[PDB]
Ligand binder design. Structure first.
Ligand SMILES: Cc1cc(F)cc(S(N)(=O)=O)c1
Ligand SMILES: Cc1cc(F)cc(S(N)(=O)=O)c1
Length: 119
């Protein structure tokens, strides 16, 4: 019932994501020189370095907020892809599956800890 445990759990999951080859296109903001109309399609850019920095700054209050930003990385890939068979989008789908598989217990444990605190 540790209400703070999610933070180190999210740091460890981000470390696993960073060291996976599939995260390379998502480690830093999308290059606007390479994709000059990116901001005509994507309203809110997001990347894993921004998520890690927000976490380390103490600017997430819960793992739900972190999870919303990570999901935004993946929805941005889905929205910008011209095809469901593109290389970057295919990498995003695998990385999303890995992230969802691992974030589920982090969210459940945190919500259970908050419920116990308010019992
Ligand atoms: C499929 C996958 C993705 C990833 F980012 C990290 C791992 S591992 N072998 O470190 O658990 C596995
Ligand atoms: C930034 C980005 C994301 C994505 F999913 C797909 C593309 S591409 N190279 O197919 O235009 C570009």
């Amino acid at each position: 019932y540790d209400i703070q445990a999610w933070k180190k759990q999210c740091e460890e999951l981000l470390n696993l994501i960073f060291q996976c080859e599939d995260s390379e296109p998502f480690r830093q903001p999308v290059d606007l020189l390479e994709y000059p109309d990116y901001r005509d399609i994507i309203d809110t850019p997001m990347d894993f370095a921004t998520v890690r920095e927000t976490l380390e700054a103490g600017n997430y209050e819960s793992p739900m907020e972190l999870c919303k930003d990570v999901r935004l990385i993946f929805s941005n890939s889905k929205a910008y892809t011209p095809s469901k068979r593109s290389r970057i989008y295919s990498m995003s789908l695998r990385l999303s599956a890995f992230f969802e598989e691992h974030i589920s217990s982090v969210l459940s444990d945190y919500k259970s800890a908050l419920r116990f605190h308010k019992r």
